[PDB]
Amino acid sequence: SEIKILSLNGGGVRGLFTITLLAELESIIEKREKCENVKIGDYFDLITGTSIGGILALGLASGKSARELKEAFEINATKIFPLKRFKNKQWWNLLRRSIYESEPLYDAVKSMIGETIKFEDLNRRVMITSVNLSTGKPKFFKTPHNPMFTMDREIRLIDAAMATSAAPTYFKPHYIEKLENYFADGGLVANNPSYIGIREVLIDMKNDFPDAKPENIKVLNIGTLSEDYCISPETLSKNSGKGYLSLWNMGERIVLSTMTANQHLQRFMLLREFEALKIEKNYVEIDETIPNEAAAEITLDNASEGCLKALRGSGKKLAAERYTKNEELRNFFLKKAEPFVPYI
Amino acid sequence: SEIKILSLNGGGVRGLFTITLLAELESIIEKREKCENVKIGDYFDLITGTSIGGILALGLASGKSARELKEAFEINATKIFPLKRFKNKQWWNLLRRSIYESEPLYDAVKSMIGETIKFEDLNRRVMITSVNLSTGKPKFFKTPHNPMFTMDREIRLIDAAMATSAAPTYFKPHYIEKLENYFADGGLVANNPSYIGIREVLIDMKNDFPDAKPENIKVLNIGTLSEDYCISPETLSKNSGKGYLSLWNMGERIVLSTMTANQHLQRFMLLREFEALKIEKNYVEIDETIPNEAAAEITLDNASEGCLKALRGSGKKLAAERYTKNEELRNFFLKKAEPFVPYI
Amino acid sequence: SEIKILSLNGGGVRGLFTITLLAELESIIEKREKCENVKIGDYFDLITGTSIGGILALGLASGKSARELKEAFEINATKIFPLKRFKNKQWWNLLRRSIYESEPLYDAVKSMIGETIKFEDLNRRVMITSVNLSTGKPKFFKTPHNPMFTMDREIRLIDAAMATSAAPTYFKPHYIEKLENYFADGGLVANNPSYIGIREVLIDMKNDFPDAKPENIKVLNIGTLSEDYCISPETLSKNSGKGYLSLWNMGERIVLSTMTANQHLQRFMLLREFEALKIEKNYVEIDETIPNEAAAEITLDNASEGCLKALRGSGKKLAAERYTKNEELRNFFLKKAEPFVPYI
Amino acid sequence: SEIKILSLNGGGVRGLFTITLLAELESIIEKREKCENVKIGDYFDLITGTSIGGILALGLASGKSARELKEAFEINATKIFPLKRFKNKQWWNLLRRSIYESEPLYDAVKSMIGETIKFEDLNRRVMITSVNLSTGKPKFFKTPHNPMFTMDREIRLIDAAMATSAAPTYFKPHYIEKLENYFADGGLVANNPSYIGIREVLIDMKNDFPDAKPENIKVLNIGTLSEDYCISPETLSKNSGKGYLSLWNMGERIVLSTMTANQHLQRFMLLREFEALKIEKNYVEIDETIPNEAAAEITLDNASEGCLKALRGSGKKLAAERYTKNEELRNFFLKKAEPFVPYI
Numbered sequence A, B, C, D: 001s002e003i004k005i006l007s008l009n010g011g012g013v014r015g016l017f018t019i020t021l022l023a024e025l026e027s028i029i030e031k032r033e034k035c036e037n038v039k040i041g042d043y044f045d046l047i048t049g050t051s052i053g054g055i056l057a058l059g060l061a062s063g064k065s066a067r068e069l070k071e072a073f074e075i076n077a078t079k080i081f082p083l084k085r086f087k088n089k090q091w092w093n094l095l096r097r098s099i100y101e102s103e104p105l106y107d108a109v110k111s112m113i114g115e116t117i118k119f120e121d122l123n124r125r126v127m128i129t130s131v132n133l134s135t136g137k138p139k140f141f142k143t144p145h146n147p148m149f150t151m152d153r154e155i156r157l158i159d160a161a162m163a164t165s166a167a168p169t170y171f172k173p174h175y176i177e178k179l180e181n182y183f184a185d186g187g188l189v190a191n192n193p194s195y196i197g198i199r200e201v202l203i204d205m206k207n208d209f210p211d212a213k214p215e216n217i218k219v220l221n222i223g224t225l226s227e228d229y230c231i232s233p234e235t236l237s238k239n240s241g242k243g244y245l246s247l248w249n250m251g252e253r254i255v256l257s258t259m260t261a262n263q264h265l266q267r268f269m270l271l272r273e274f275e276a277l278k279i280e281k282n283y284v285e286i287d288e289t290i291p292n293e294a295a296a297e298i299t300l301d302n303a304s305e306g307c308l309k310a311l312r313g314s315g316k317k318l319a320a321e322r323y324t325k326n327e328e329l330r331n332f333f334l335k336k337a338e339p340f341v342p343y344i
């Protein structure tokens, strides 16, 4: 047996790299296998996403090809993140209102996945991570692969996508009318949903895969040019005895360390678990650390055509290179995954 | 076979409840079993801790009884959190320097565990969760239960204890001279180390327990009167359109939502995993929620005499009741755990 | 055989959570079982209520669906607790006259249950708790499931609902013309009618169920977001030597402690009784403690839009979660309860 | 087999009537049976008390005769309620500090039972009711008749007696050092512990009495001249629309109505349950209503020698009258109850 999981991280604009890599991968399969109408979502038994990766995960699960999702991203990339609002991010605007607007994101997501499709209408298993601000617990939107799951069978995908992409300071929290709860970005809990995806197969998807073990689970994780955050040695050495304004400038250093360490933590337990089982090859991670000079330019919410070119170029480059070398990456697209038929 | 794990959460001054419950548990075993000189750390194969729970974890691992640690806690509680610094938590002080000081905490830990004991001298396995601010990854101090471990064999316990208790704003980051790195509180990654404790037995603790499975693992997670943080519904309804002043009042609401959701998540994977194999009884959690009026009084760093009595009273109360009803709690102290000898 | 009991607590506006949970339960049964025109009151052989839970109990007993009562409550919630009077809860008003008015509550119940239905017309057994102020003994309004019971046969249902909701300080005592006696809130003797509901089946309902024992009795107690009241440790430590103004500020602390202790006691007798017979699973209690920040806003009489959203959101979320996990909750709706025919 | 339970209510100085009735009954047994040194505590398998009834319950459980306690109560009654107090019970005094003092009560109780006696040393089963002000839940002090619990074995009886007699407005809350919790009068929870005594036998005392049913249980409840409380019809009719100052004059009319209705409710379940099994003769209640003219004179804190004579006279005449008529009363003292041996 074999279970394939596709995991997308959250990277805001950097999700363009995630979708460009998948779009380039789709073209390679079409050319090499002499196939047509190749959808990258047909090769995975479960698709997990977070933040901008959640929106792409819902689109792939809905039935749209990565190439179609790729085109909608570039057109709406400059609309989700307007240049005027991107330039104006001073402290007075930061402490008065949330940066950017939610309507352009709503219109962008509406174009890709739609506005009326619900989780019970999906033929592909999905999981979208989110944080329930009203309660404080993390809420995970997912298709009813568990027959007893009746909480979000009638929740529109556009609500889950908009909830998981509501960055605490980059967008206002998303209000879901069907649940009467406000939600925040899913990156506050699992910015890398690779680990929790394996947990779902061994816990929730026990009806389609009764004899499921981590040995028979292959994870294809597509990063968003992850940047390992850390406090500058000069800042730590000289300002460790200061508070807030100098060290932990406002909430910035405390939150960024919290997400980065938590993201590192969940990545570690995945690596440790596969190491102990001698199945480290099952976790196929496709990511590339962005250089220092490009880091100052390619930010979380930079939609300039110069930065858009670099992300598209990196996605095409990694897709071609990793397909040539990583044999396990090629084994992912050897056979189409069975469609998810909900059990009633 | 049986493997027993003790997990202690981090809550600053509320750790008095954690140690009072263990101290009360020690006296109960002495009276009912008619034995003398009973140490609560002799019944566990691994002790995990975080923040104040980490400091108590090192005390039990070293060989000091919970009653001795409890006595040192009350005397040092006022010194760790002086009333002069506690009342002066205004913004013009928090924006300039971190409140409280590390020296009073250093002496409290020194009288608790010692000053020259190193991880290679311990006869009991232990975790200490921490965040490496210099690198951004979480750093876990632990005894060499894995024979290939050479990083903390020559690290003093007092350095690990001060690293895990270095709250981002309540204390300055702890600088370990032997590692040349600055460390922060371990509650940023795992306020409840119960889940990561189970992972240790199946991953690194294989030299002593080769056939280790979650079925043969019993966890005694002692709470710290955990408070389920959430955004006020009036605030969310009225201030969702604002940013960083009304909603997310400075960084406070972002961090608390992040840690609580992460702490909720790790407990959720913990509960979901045990429920999968129908061994939910293996996880024993001893914790209760603080009433609304008391929660306003019992804060993270309140060392008032009235608050100390409530924490001590709650620990004595819960220990007696849970021992009577929870048979699984009584099964922990049926046999002493074998001493851990490092492999050379 | 099997006897099913529904018990509802009194929480003022928090009863919206009680009816929202019941309303969403009705939709789940309709969606999963493909049924139509489902009523949550047709699956219970006895319905017990108190205060705002008594009004909902009377509505379900007559034959109204939980969804209709939910819609009626939302429209009238603002009317019952006007913002002008809610904000004007100062000391001169409280010392001169009762807060709020009875006529808006009278109209709300009138549009919810009617104004002419009497206890002899009901086809479902119900019991409503109240306090007879004229005599001092607790008076219980109930349908004549006992053939010898002729006291409430010819009394309107709205009078019982009006009587049980007459909070001592939030409403004026309700005067029943047919009985010539004044009545107060039913929460003074039983805020949780779960225990007294079991006694009724074994004492009064002996004709329909001759061989009735607690093993065949299942109770579905729907909470009202109960809060565990206690005196703050700072108040107890510093003001135990004072009187009234400081400790027991007027009658507030005495009445709250007496009501909370009595409510805790009756629940304790239920848990002790069931655990002695190894039938603890028969008591299905669906309740959740409010977080400290939310508990400040969500009070007994706050009808603001933000608070109403949270109560509705919690009910929707709780109903979905417990239905998936708790198998005993699902077993309640496996078969409709037999209609109650008053024997003559 | 038969199980005999003695239950004593709480009425302050009215407990002198309870002890006088108990002391007189000893004299009749001595005269009729021609025996020497008869203690009524040896004829009961469980003794339950509340407030002043709890203090007498502990004295009987220790092994002291009722006559000895009657002599001690007579001299100490004036000191417990000094005539300097009870005459200056002005509103400002009550608005500032609690009336009376605990030290005269503490010294009085010490002469009754002692100071070093503990529950584990008792040879008779006892159960004392109290409410934990720190937690809000009722706390019941009892001997270890069920060996599986260990909380009160090392608590002095004088602490339980002080806790259960701590009237919220007549005495300051009692602080127990061994538990770090404040306590109040048990009359708030159960002023008549007759009902909870039956549940204690059928739940906790399953070791000595495994096959225990309510049929084989006889209860001898000795009241303290209980007076039913009801709001005056003139006040109710005229001040129904008023608040506090007129209707519910401060907390008085709310606490009293809540207290008397809860006491009525608990007695009602005892009556209703016994009628169901047709064992109404088992509940032998010895109490009479105080005439109206002396009702205003004989209060719960009146230490005048005239009221003491009336209480002594009522107890002396009730014991003689009931013994001749009530055959079931005589059957209580037919055989001595087996001593309580705490199983270890």
Ligand SMILES: Nc1nc2c(ncn2[C@@H]2O[C@@H]3COP(=O)(O)O[C@H]4[C@@H](O)[C@H](n5cnc6c(N)ncnc65)O[C@@H]4COP(=O)(O)O[C@H]3[C@H]2O)c(=O)[nH]1
Pocket (backbone or CB within 6 Å): A137, A138, A139, A140, A141, A142, A143, A144, A148, A149, A150, A151, A152, A153, A196, A197, A199, A200, B265, B268, B269, B272, C320, C321, C324, C325
């Ligand atoms: N997400 C979800 N939950 C549902 C659904 N129908 C019923 N439920 C129930 O609601 C509970 C809470 O859902 P949540 O997503 O808000 O919280 C979740 C989420 O925060 C987390 N979680 C779920 N799956 C996870 C996973 N695979 N990895 C890591 N964390 C996970 O654990 C919580 C408890 O999961 P659970 O399966 O024991 O309980 C569910 C589950 O029993 C449904 O359609 N979706």
Ligand SMILES: Nc1nc2c(ncn2[C@@H]2O[C@@H]3COP(=O)(O)O[C@H]4[C@@H](O)[C@H](n5cnc6c(N)ncnc65)O[C@@H]4COP(=O)(O)O[C@H]3[C@H]2O)c(=O)[nH]1
Pocket (backbone or CB within 6 Å): A265, A268, A269, A272, B137, B138, B139, B140, B141, B142, B143, B144, B148, B149, B150, B151, B152, B153, B196, B197, B199, B200
């Ligand atoms: N903690 C530790 N690590 C040691 C020691 N000697 C060598 N090492 C090595 O250093 C690596 C990083 O240590 P860390 O504790 O800073 O990061 C750790 C810690 O952040 C996390 N981790 C470790 N055990 C964990 C656990 N049980 N649960 C959750 N996370 C855990 O994963 C990281 C990688 O663990 P690993 O065992 O694969 O690699 C170790 C391990 O191979 C040693 O004495 N202690």
Ligand SMILES: Nc1nc2c(ncn2[C@@H]2O[C@@H]3COP(=O)(O)O[C@H]4[C@@H](O)[C@H](n5cnc6c(N)ncnc65)O[C@@H]4COP(=O)(O)O[C@H]3[C@H]2O)c(=O)[nH]1
Pocket (backbone or CB within 6 Å): C137, C138, C139, C140, C141, C142, C143, C144, C148, C149, C150, C151, C152, C153, C196, C197, C199, C200, C201, C203, D265, D268, D269, D272
């Ligand atoms: N409630 C009620 N009582 C009736 C009716 N017709 C005749 N009665 C009689 O009037 C008595 C006083 O009614 P109450 O409800 O005001 O007091 C009740 C009520 O305060 C309480 N009670 C009744 N059922 C209870 C129950 N199931 N659980 C707890 N307490 C209960 O005990 C009191 C006396 O019990 P009871 O039912 O034997 O006495 C009834 C009963 O014998 C009638 O239609 N309703």
Ligand SMILES: Nc1nc2c(ncn2[C@@H]2O[C@@H]3COP(=O)(O)O[C@H]4[C@@H](O)[C@H](n5cnc6c(N)ncnc65)O[C@@H]4COP(=O)(O)O[C@H]3[C@H]2O)c(=O)[nH]1
Pocket (backbone or CB within 6 Å): B320, B321, B324, B325, C265, C268, C269, C271, C272, D137, D138, D139, D140, D141, D142, D143, D149, D150, D151, D152, D153, D196, D197, D199, D200, D201, D203
């Ligand atoms: N009463 C008591 N309980 C003890 C002791 N040692 C351990 N415990 C445990 O602590 C729990 C709570 O004690 P509490 O007396 O403060 O609350 C008690 C008390 O408030 C109430 N209660 C106990 N016995 C009762 C009874 N017979 N009738 C009515 N209410 C009763 O119910 C609560 C829960 O009782 P429980 O037996 O299930 O759990 C006990 C019991 O398991 C002990 O010495 N006494």
